[PDB]
Write a protein that binds this ligand. Structure first.
Ligand SMILES: *C(=O)C1=CN=C(C(=O)O)CS[C@H]1c1cn2c(n1)COCC2
Length: 363
């Protein structure tokens, strides 16, 4: 098997050319191998201040936030608070438009409601205006027919999924997912004392960080998760090996998020997480990551009933913000995984290629 020495070489020999080519100021990587995380840090968290990346540097996860949403929703299912087969309207009775009949919580969670757009528009500034948006929405497709990746879909799922708990999303997430997993440096809102750890993002040479949206059902979730490479490694480990998670509903929620709900070409949609059967070749995964494909409306095949987690899977998620680019992938059958956090948003295919190359060294 590969030694720790060899693994360190593989990671450096992969990441250093990638950062040069993609002009990445700083990256934190964790590889999960032989039951533990291995950490590698590169470059700068803050160029002007000459602060290096460390295992405590906070990065913006962007859309990898959706994996936390998915698990939180799974946990709520396992508690009996929601069911994926319930109508959206069960959790939002004020949503009276008849276009919503036949749209399930599952459809919101997995982007199959029938054309909810990528973004919630900026006109949406509060709950009254969020309601007007969803009430006015005209589906382009029937439910359960077309996948269109969308913050307006899973964001609403997250907001509604926590309603029975009585907690807002940020508090539900922290209480039910983060704290039990000891992810104690994972934030929506970075506390003031934690600010020294927060990297700057870089976009066309400008230092940038995430903004917020207007207050409401989606605020905390849109502001997106920030975390360091250690917490993210432990997040990957929990999702790779939920058998080691003691809380019964959270263990089940992790499994629900890695279940297969829909097939779309060579991939399968989970709750937040996406999956391909393992073995998979690099070009399959890399080509599917291009935004011309990843953001396209594509036909789905229902997996009814949902398939529970398949150990021989490539499980992954990309996520970006204006200044950050991150990627996570793991293969439960092999008990290997990787986290790559960077403070520039560089092309998703390049992230997948590097992650694949590193994990390939370990099988
Ligand atoms: C997730 O990583 C993600 C979410 N969705 C959108 C979007 O709502 O516009 C686009 S794909 C991706 C994303 C979001 N941002 C970027 N990429 C780049 O920085 C701006 C925010």
């Amino acid at each position: 098997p590969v030694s720790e020495k060899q693994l360190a070489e593989v990671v450096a020999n992969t990441v250093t050319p990638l950062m040069k080519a993609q002009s990445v100021p700083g990256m934190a990587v964790a590889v999960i191998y032989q039951g533990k995380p291995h950490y590698y840090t590169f470059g700068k968290a803050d160029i002007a201040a000459n602060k290096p990346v460390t295992p405590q540097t906070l990065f913006e996860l962007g859309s990898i936030s959706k994996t936390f949403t998915g698990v939180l929703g799974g946990d709520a299912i396992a508690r009996g608070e929601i069911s994926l087969d319930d109508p959206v309207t069960r959790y939002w009775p004020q949503l009276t438009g008849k276009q919503w009949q036949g749209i399930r919580m599952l459809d919101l969670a997995t982007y199959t409601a029938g054309g909810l757009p990528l973004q919630v528009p900026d006109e949406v500034t509060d709950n009254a205006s969020l309601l007007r948006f969803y009430q006015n929405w005209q589906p382009q497709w029937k439910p359960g027919t077309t996948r269109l990746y969308a913050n307006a879909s899973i964001g609403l799922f997250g907001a509604l999924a926590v309603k029975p708990s009585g907690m807002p999303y940020e508090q539900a997430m922290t209480t039910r997912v983060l704290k039990p997993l000891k992810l104690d440096h994972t934030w929506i809102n970075v506390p003031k004392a934690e600010e020294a750890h927060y990297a700057w993002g870089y976009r066309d040479g400008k230092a940038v960080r995430a903004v917020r949206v207007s207050p409401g059902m989606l605020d905390a979730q849109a502001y997106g998760v920030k975390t360091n490479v250690q917490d993210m490694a432990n997040w990957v480990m929990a999702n790779m090996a939920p058998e080691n998670v003691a809380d019964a509903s959270l263990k089940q929620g992790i499994a629900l998020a890695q279940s297969r709900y829909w097939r779309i070409g060579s991939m399968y949609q989970g709750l937040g997480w996406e999956m391909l059967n393992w073995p998979v070749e690099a070009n399959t995964v890399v080509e599917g990551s291009d935004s011309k494909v990843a953001l396209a409306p594509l036909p789905v095949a229902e997996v009814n009933p949902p398939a529970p987690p398949v150990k021989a899977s490539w499980v992954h998620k990309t996520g970006s913000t204006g200044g950050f680019g991150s990627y996570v992938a793991f293969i439960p059958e092999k008990q290997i995984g990787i986290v790559m956090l960077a403070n520039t948003s560089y092309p998703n295919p390049a992230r997948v290629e590097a992650a694949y190359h590193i994990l390939e060294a370990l099988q």
